[PDB]
Amino acid sequence: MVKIRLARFGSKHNPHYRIVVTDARRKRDGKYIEKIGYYDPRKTTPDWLKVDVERARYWLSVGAQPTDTARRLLRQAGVFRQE
Amino acid sequence: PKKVLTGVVVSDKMQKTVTVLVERQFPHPLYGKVIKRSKKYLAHDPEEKYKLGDVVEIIESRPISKRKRFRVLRLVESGRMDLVEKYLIRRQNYESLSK
Amino acid sequence: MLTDPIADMLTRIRNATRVYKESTDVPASRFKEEILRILAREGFIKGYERVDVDGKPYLRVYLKYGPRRQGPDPRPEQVIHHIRRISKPGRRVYVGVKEIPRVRRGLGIAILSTSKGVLTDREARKLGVGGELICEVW
Amino acid sequence: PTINQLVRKGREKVRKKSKVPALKGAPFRRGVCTVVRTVTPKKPNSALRKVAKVRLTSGYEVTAYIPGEGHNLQEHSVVLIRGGRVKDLWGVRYHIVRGVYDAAGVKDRKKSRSKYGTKKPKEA
Amino acid sequence: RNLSALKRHRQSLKRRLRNKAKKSAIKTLSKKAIQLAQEGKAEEALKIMRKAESLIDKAAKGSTLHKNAAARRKSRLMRKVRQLLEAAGAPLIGGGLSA
Amino acid sequence: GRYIGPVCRLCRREGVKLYLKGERCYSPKCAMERRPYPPGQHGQKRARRPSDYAVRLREKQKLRRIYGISERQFRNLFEEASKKKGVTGSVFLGLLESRLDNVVYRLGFAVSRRQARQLVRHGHITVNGRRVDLPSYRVRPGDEIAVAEKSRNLELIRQNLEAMKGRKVGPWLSLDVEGMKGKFLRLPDREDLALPVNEQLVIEFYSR
RNA sequence: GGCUAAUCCCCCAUGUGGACCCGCCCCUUGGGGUGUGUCCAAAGGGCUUUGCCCGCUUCCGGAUGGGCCCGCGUCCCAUCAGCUAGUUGGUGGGGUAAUGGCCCACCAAGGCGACGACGGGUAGCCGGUCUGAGAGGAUGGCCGGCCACAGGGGCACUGAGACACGGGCCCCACUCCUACGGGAGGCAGCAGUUAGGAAUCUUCCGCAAUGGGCGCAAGCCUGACGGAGCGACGCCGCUUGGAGGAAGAAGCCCUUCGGGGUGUAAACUCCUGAACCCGGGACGAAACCCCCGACGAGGGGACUGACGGUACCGGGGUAAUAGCGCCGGCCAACUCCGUGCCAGCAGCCGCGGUAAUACGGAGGGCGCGAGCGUUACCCGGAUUCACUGGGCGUAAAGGGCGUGUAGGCGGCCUGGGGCGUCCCAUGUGAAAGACCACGGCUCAACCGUGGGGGAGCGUGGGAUACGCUCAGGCUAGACG
Numbered sequence A: 001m002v003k004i005r006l007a008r009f010g011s012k013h014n015p016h017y018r019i020v021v022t023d024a025r026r027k028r029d030g031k032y033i034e035k036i037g038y039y040d041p042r043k044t045t046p047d048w049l050k051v052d053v054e055r056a057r058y059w060l061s062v063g064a065q066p067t068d069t070a071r072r073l074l075r076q077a078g079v080f081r082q083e
Numbered sequence B: 001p002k003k004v005l006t007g008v009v010v011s012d013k014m015q016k017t018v019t020v021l022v023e024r025q026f027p028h029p030l031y032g033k034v035i036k037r038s039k040k041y042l043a044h045d046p047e048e049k050y051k052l053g054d055v056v057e058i059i060e061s062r063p064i065s066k067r068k069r070f071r072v073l074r075l076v077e078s079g080r081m082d083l084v085e086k087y088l089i090r091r092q093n094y095e096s097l098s099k
Numbered sequence C: 001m002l003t004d005p006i007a008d009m010l011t012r013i014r015n016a017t018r019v020y021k022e023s024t025d026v027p028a029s030r031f032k033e034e035i036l037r038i039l040a041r042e043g044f045i046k047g048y049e050r051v052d053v054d055g056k057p058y059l060r061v062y063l064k065y066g067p068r069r070q071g072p073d074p075r076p077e078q079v080i081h082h083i084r085r086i087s088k089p090g091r092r093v094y095v096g097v098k099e100i101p102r103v104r105r106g107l108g109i110a111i112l113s114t115s116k117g118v119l120t121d122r123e124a125r126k127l128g129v130g131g132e133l134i135c136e137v138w
Numbered sequence D: 001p002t003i004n005q006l007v008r009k010g011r012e013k014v015r016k017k018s019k020v021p022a023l024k025g026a027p028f029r030r031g032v033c034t035v036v037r038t039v040t041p042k043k044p045n046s047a048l049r050k051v052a053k054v055r056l057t058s059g060y061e062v063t064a065y066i067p068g069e070g071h072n073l074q075e076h077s078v079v080l081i082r083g084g085r086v087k088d089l090w091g092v093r094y095h096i097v098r099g100v101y102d103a104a105g106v107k108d109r110k111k112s113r114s115k116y117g118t119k120k121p122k123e124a
Numbered sequence E: 001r002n003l004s005a006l007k008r009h010r011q012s013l014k015r016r017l018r019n020k021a022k023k024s025a026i027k028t029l030s031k032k033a034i035q036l037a038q039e040g041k042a043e044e045a046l047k048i049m050r051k052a053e054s055l056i057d058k059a060a061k062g063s064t065l066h067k068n069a070a071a072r073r074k075s076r077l078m079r080k081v082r083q084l085l086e087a088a089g090a091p092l093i094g095g096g097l098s099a
Numbered sequence F: 001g002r003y004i005g006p007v008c009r010l011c012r013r014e015g016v017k018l019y020l021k022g023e024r025c026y027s028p029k030c031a032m033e034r035r036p037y038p039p040g041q042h043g044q045k046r047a048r049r050p051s052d053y054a055v056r057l058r059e060k061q062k063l064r065r066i067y068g069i070s071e072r073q074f075r076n077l078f079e080e081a082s083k084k085k086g087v088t089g090s091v092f093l094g095l096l097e098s099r100l101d102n103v104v105y106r107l108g109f110a111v112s113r114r115q116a117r118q119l120v121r122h123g124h125i126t127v128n129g130r131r132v133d134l135p136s137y138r139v140r141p142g143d144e145i146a147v148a149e150k151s152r153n154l155e156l157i158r159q160n161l162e163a164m165k166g167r168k169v170g171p172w173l174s175l176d177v178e179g180m181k182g183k184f185l186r187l188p189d190r191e192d193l194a195l196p197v198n199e200q201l202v203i204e205f206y207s208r
Numbered sequence G: 001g002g003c004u005a006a007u008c009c010c011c012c013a014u015g016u017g018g019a020c021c022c023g024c025c026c027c028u029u030g031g032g033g034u035g036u037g038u039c040c041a042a043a044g045g046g047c048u049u050u051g052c053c054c055g056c057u058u059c060c061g062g063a064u065g066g067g068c069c070c071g072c073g074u075c076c077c078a079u080c081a082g083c084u085a086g087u088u089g090g091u092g093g094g095g096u097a098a099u100g101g102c103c104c105a106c107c108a109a110g111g112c113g114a115c116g117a118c119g120g121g122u123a124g125c126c127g128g129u130c131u132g133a134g135a136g137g138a139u140g141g142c143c144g145g146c147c148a149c150a151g152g153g154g155c156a157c158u159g160a161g162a163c164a165c166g167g168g169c170c171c172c173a174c175u176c177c178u179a180c181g182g183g184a185g186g187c188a189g190c191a192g193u194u195a196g197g198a199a200u201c202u203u204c205c206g207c208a209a210u211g212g213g214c215g216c217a218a219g220c221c222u223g224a225c226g227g228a229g230c231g232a233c234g235c236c237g238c239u240u241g242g243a244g245g246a247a248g249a250a251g252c253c254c255u256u257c258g259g260g261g262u263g264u265a266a267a268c269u270c271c272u273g274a275a276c277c278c279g280g281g282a283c284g285a286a287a288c289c290c291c292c293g294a295c296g297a298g299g300g301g302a303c304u305g306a307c308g309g310u311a312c313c314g315g316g317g318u319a320a321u322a323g324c325g326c327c328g329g330c331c332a333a334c335u336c337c338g339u340g341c342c343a344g345c346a347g348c349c350g351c352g353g354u355a356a357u358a359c360g361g362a363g364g365g366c367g368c369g370a371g372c373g374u375u376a377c378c379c380g381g382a383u384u385c386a387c388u389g390g391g392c393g394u395a396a397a398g399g400g401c402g403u404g405u406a407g408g409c410g411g412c413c414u415g416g417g418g419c420g421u422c423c424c425a426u427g428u429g430a431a432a433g434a435c436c437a438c439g440g441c442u443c444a445a446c447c448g449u450g451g452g453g454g455a456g457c458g459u460g461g462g463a464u465a466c467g468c469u470c471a472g473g474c475u476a477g478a479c480g
Ligand SMILES: [Mg+2]
Pocket: A023, A025, A026
């Protein structure tokens, strides 16, 4: 069930996340389909999130599901706003 | 690209099958001379259309037997029996070199 | 039989120059003639002409040397100090365009024979093509 | 050789032998002495060189040198073998290591003590 | 100990028996139709044959067959029935067959 | 920790004056006055012509001993320089000169390179307003090297500062002595630097 | 043996559609359409039960994951030269999701091999790594990808998926239970024990984060994981003080008895203030849920830490660990004493058989420094397997000579083709690493973000000198 989720790229005590499209059944940290974004929990830069919506939109079109966290980030960047 | 190769038909013995011979020249990986090798492809002649000493195109195919993956596309040229004679001889030479 | 005619030209030339001849006859063909055209252009030979020898046609390669010299060994510097085949039958060589060689940091050449014709190193770079790397000269 | 000959035949990569079967490749092996002894050196010198035949945990049995001055070792001592040869003695390819297992360090020795396995002297 | 996907085995047993049954049914029927065909007793052969076809698609409905599994078994059967129906076949019921 | 012990002896062994000592490496006590020969029994005896190796060695040595830097730090910093795009000798020198302890020295807060290492280390020093204690911190051009107002009252600090009145600071820097603020305007060149060292001898040392 | 519920099983029905046989059309390997005949569906549950949420059925496409097949690449031995019976093809058939001797019967007599078949030896493969000026050599630990195995061998069942590590049957070895009948096991999962070994950690914390399973949810599960502990195993930062201070204390060292050395080193002077004590004290964490709006969007809106009272900020504050190798040459660093072919040193050359800068201490010296030496192994050096880049008259090396098979190599002129070769376009060359730039932890190590590069191979286009090649000339080679 092809998902969209945070995978963990930082160092110990320094997380950074690649928000990615990947089959449910890969490792968290192993080969993904596409990397659509990044996340920075400790927010050490004005870029602590990014998306490329029209990409996230594509992967939604084909029925990827996100994490709840992932969905949260996606909506932060608002793949979701329809107005 | 289903792959096509071109070769000479050096054995017709089998039923509906021809032994095809395909040369490859390629530059040697270190010494850089161009060395020219080859292999026998086992290729599927359904109608026994093709005959020994022909030259054919052979195409990567849906498997026919263990060892047949290729069938016979066209006739590029008919009549090179010299080539056949080469192969027949290389193999003829084998009869020395033993015991 | 002759065997690599182009080597045999470059050689006829190498020997000729070391014994300081004014000229030499290399038996002829359009490819040698093209190799030579480039030599003349580049300043290695004086030039060359087409002659006949007992009917069978050759090329006089007229030769260039330095001026005469000081002390023991008055023999003048060579103009072709170095000439050598690179691709040979039995090992052929081909450079891409990004492999074409810098000869003596530029003061020499490389005759490449390309699909655009026979050119020097720089000539091929500026032309943007690769080829059979024939000889270097310097 | 021509090039066609290099294609046909090609250069031979060159093997080598391990001057040491401690086998196992290991940096040291543990073993149990059999003989503790002395021997007479090769031609250019003269002396008494202390050495032990050993059974090694490698299913392997070898004369091994006993470096230093004072050595305690005897016929049932269990010792750790080193590697390196004594150029003027016959068949001794390895060294014993002082301070390890039964072989104790060279006592009274003030100078090169990493080797020789001797601890550091106190001072006041 | 007593890990409880023990239950899984327990089930897999029952399922086993169910598939086996269903599938035996299928065979015995199929052969029945076939013999019947050899005999060229046409209409009879057909009525069995249809029971067989159906029971096949039923087997399909679940985990006995699914897929092309069934379709393979059916095409095989029908071909063979029809082929077997020449010794003067004149295929009476013609229920299962396109005219 | 890089070498802590009788320094003026290194003034001696490198044959030349390298003041890690501050004042008194000025005042004619440096022992480099009237005892310039190297240390130990054989110091005052003849010099056997030094191997090519030896030459290269002690030049590398002079150049390191100056900055009081570990060989580790030094050589890593060096291969840093040889990767860095452009001429290695100079690049290197600029890098070493870019060390925070060094800048603190060059700016005149402490009389010794070493003293200044203490200054960095104990956090008496800030850069762009933020305290830094790591002597190896890289000062990038445009950075502002300042004393720490907390210690701006310190005996030693204002001491050295007052002696720094009207004295001129190297051209790749600027200094304000009333605010202790300073500025590292540019990475310095071979020329900007007086170093009693042939750098290519050091590059040459690391060839082999 | 008996009772019984269901989204468990079965039978009719409906046929959107689908399966299958025969026909037709298009397409072209079993792709798509169509007609007739035959066969094929389903399950209910929860709520505020008049309407929605959770499911169920047949189909069509999507997405992601995979099966299978082909070219090419992928170690040593030729003192392994022949190998081959389902073996090689075929017809029919069984099997499968699916091609296939995958299997079975019947038919033919093939298939492979010096371009190294068969045999034997070793071995998980790659991204990459180490080394190298490069070409190359070596390697494949951790991280990522693939494979394979789960005590050894065989086997299937269930299922979308397995021939299934913590599922099942059988055989074998072993451990344990045993009323001798027979049963039970399977840490190459996290820890831990035990052996073996030179040697490799805690039977810790946590579900807070991230990820995964089931669930409408609340939520349970997770030795994935996030953390902590251990070991200088590696890398990186850091401390063992800073400044002043004798023409230079004492001890110890040589001494030409004048002196020289240790050495600004110490003592002492003064300043900072590792440890440590005190207070404050994190980010990682906003979702799931809450409410409003329609359980959407949007909008607000509150609960949620293992690490941890740790990182860190403020305050106060003590001069506060040094070691290891080496000093004959290669090689940076020399003297005295002691020993006298001994004791010993030793990588190679080679030291010691009374003046030893080579052995053993000492003073001094060099090199590194929380390390420093040693052994082992790999590349380097080694242009010493020579593609780059070697040789064979006497140094190792021309086969005793020839005929001539495969093979390698091929004069001059023109034309066709465009296989080699070259150029452009595009696809691919995952990520991580590596290179560049910027940035984030006070720095670095470490990390992030972006950029760039890249042999190779697919496709399309193009060039034709050389190399192939086909056709036609030639006569300088060769033969007559
Ligand atoms: Mg998977």
